[PDB]
Amino acid sequence: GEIEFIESSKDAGFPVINTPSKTKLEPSVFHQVFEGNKEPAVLRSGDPRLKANFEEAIFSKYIGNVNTHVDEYMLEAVDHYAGQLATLDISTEPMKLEDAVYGTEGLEALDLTTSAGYPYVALGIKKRDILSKKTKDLTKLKECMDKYGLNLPMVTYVKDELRSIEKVAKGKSRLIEASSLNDSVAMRQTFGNLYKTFHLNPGVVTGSAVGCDPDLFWSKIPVMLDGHLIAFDYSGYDASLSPVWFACLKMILEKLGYTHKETNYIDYLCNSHHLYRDKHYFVRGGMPSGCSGTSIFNSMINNIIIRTLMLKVYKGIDLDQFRMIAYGDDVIASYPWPIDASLLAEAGKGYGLIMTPADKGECFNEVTWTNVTFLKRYFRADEQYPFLVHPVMPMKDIHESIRWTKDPKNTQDHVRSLCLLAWHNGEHEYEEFIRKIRSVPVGRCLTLPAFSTLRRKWLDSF
Numbered sequence: 001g002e003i004e005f006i007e008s009s010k011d012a013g014f015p016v017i018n019t020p021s022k023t024k025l026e027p028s029v030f031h032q033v034f035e036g037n038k039e040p041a042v043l044r045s046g047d048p049r050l051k052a053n054f055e056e057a058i059f060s061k062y063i064g065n066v067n068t069h070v071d072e073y074m075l076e077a078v079d080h081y082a083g084q085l086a087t088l089d090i091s092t093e094p095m096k097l098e099d100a101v102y103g104t105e106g107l108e109a110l111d112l113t114t115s116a117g118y119p120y121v122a123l124g125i126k127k128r129d130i131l132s133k134k135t136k137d138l139t140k141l142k143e144c145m146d147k148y149g150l151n152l153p154m155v156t157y158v159k160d161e162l163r164s165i166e167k168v169a170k171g172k173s174r175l176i177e178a179s180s181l182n183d184s185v186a187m188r189q190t191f192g193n194l195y196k197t198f199h200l201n202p203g204v205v206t207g208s209a210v211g212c213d214p215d216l217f218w219s220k221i222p223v224m225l226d227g228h229l230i231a232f233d234y235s236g237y238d239a240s241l242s243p244v245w246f247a248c249l250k251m252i253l254e255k256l257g258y259t260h261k262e263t264n265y266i267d268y269l270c271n272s273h274h275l276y277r278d279k280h281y282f283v284r285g286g287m288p289s290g291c292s293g294t295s296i297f298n299s300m301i302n303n304i305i306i307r308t309l310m311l312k313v314y315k316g317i318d319l320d321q322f323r324m325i326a327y328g329d330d331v332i333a334s335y336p337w338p339i340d341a342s343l344l345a346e347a348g349k350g351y352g353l354i355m356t357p358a359d360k361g362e363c364f365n366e367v368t369w370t371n372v373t374f375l376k377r378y379f380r381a382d383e384q385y386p387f388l389v390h391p392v393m394p395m396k397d398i399h400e401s402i403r404w405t406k407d408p409k410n411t412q413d414h415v416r417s418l419c420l421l422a423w424h425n426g427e428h429e430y431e432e433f434i435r436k437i438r439s440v441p442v443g444r445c446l447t448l449p450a451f452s453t454l455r456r457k458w459l460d461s462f
């Protein structure tokens, strides 16, 4: 992706979008009990911790585009993956508006908590002013969609989250693009049944883990992934995507039965218009992280990409023996023979993708079931039930998270969520985690699950 044009919003008649510039994150009561290094992301230019130009840093992810046709490798990649998805009988019929807004099996109700985007954010109109869970009212929504239409600008927010010392200093804060409520709803109508099928079928047929429950899904992954593991990281995957990868996505959508008209919304993602505070800008390429379907579309594109690179370097490859599971940029994969990921990475660079060794580190290559991570979690077979696999979030990350809060009123839910991740690290680690929590008075006011209870419920869930 490439920023093609940027100017002051007022020149085009856009008001300044007044997005948050002060973090909602504050030290929790556990801040001194546990060790950690992470701090809130930089949200504004004048932040004293900056050791770089903020506005330059946050847009530096847009590294450019490679301008190419959809080549022979891409075409075969699309064919192969399309053949997998054909198995699922995805419906290209529009999802009914009520289902697409207020919830159905495989597609949770539209989040009423997030930004309603443009122009609502300039009018002080929130999602809850238009929508109502209790009523399932579609009347105001239909009015709004008729009044303002589709293809509205996206509103760029800086993500308010914890970041490493390095990412704070370098000003490498992440951005979220909020699609207008109008476009979110329209895309959910158009692609909702596809969203639904993906959510209901995480695994190696969709090549997707979006919507998965790691407590359950992790025992299935080594069964699905037969051979030598392949994993690598991307640097700035979303923003690196060139228009050619969106063309591939449109081709795969058409093979599923979507019409040229229905795939027009992919152009909205690819060639996008954004508002950031007092500026507005156009991007050619780049997945706008935050719009409807961007996790699923990022995953589908990743399925095309990896196959393309394999076909290009290993002309003798048998993709029918290749398996992969993506969650956006994150990938875990296998092939029955060793594959040199460093070769794939160089082929990736030719397509404007920046691929690096798995989980930082120096080489590409020797990934094992012991060191592989996916969705930030390691894989550890249960010692007693060896066919069941623990997702293991590092205690370091759990410690980082408990030291901060966006609202102390949520302490019970926050700490409980962390317990559900922590116990997979083993009984001794859990017991210590609970002891430290309880060394603060608040900690003794919380309902914390016992290890044996967590383990029992987990075992029973299968």
Ligand code: NA
Binding pocket: 001, 269, 270, 271, 272, 283, 284, 285, 286, 287, 288
């Ligand atoms: Na874009």
